[PDB]
Write an enzyme that holds these catalytic residues in place. Structure first.
Site: not given
Ligand SMILES: [Cl-]
Ligand SMILES: [Cl-]
Ligand SMILES: [Mg+2]
Ligand SMILES: [Sm+3]
Ligand SMILES: [Sm+3]
Ligand SMILES: [Sm+3]
Lengths: 146, 146
Positions: A16, A25
């Site tokens: 990840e 993000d």
């Protein structure tokens, strides 16, 4: 009951990515650690927040509760710890609903373990690239079969 | 309790993008409509699934329930519909936790509605681009003030 192992957490972190300073993000959501969007120490994740690797791991173990709960509710056959850790990594990526409808789940529940492992490789597309997640799927499959 | 308006749905669809054919998002998660990743009619989203615009609206209102709940939970002052619709769009993007910690919310609950509106413009960064969400924020701010 069964839960993700330390090996499972390390491997998931390395699939990840970990970021110990808060960031936004690609959609704009403040994130830290390994995909943690919730609070940390009672504060909203925001620019300026930093955390340790210990905190990142403990946040991830808690954020995996939906994953562990999905495995408990949907999987009706035994899993060894390597299988379990690999499933956690797949599900954390593709999400509960995708897993619920997957050939991985169907095959596992038939006790077709090799076919379940192979069916990880089906979860390979993202955006405009039909196989960009295949290397991750191969690594997870290798963990499952370990 | 308040609810999103028809205009609010139309504006949110414009901001988010609507895709009536299933696709795999940038992370690998099967998605359809306006960010719907859960089941549709009892089945997992998967390649080849298509839905109508009206079904996409239905799924969006299901997926907005956490947003509407968050506004109901957190905001203690009057909101007109344009304000409400703009907030739905912001929150659906940045998430509940980010909104809970935000200057938008703090200013709103002080009834400094212009300052709340201007605080939309803080939620502009995504990834490595410091202002990629600013045009959306400006449109949401304009709706809020209209
Ligand atoms: Cl915490
Ligand atoms: Cl439909
Ligand atoms: Mg559980
Ligand atoms: Sm500790
Ligand atoms: Sm817990
Ligand atoms: Sm830019």
């Amino acid at each position: 009951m069964m839960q993700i192992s330390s090996n499972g957490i390390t491997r998931l972190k390395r699939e990840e990515g970990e970021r110990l300073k808060a960031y936004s993000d690609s959609r704009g959501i403040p994130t830290i650690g390994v995909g943690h969007t919730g609070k940390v120490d009672g504060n909203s994740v925001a620019s300026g927040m930093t955390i340790t690797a210990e905190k990142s791991s403990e946040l991830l173990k808690e954020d995996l509760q939906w994953v562990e709960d999905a495995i408990s509710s949907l999987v009706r056959v035994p899993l060894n710890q390597n299988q379990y850790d690999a499933m956690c990594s797949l599900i954390f990526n593709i999400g509960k609903s995708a897993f619920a409808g997957s050939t991985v789940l169907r095959q596992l529940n038939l006790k077709n373990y090799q076919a379940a492992a192979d069916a990880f490789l089906l979860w390979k597309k993202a955006g405009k690239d039909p196989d960009i997640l295949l290397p991750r799927r191969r690594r997870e499959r290798a963990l499952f079969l370990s």
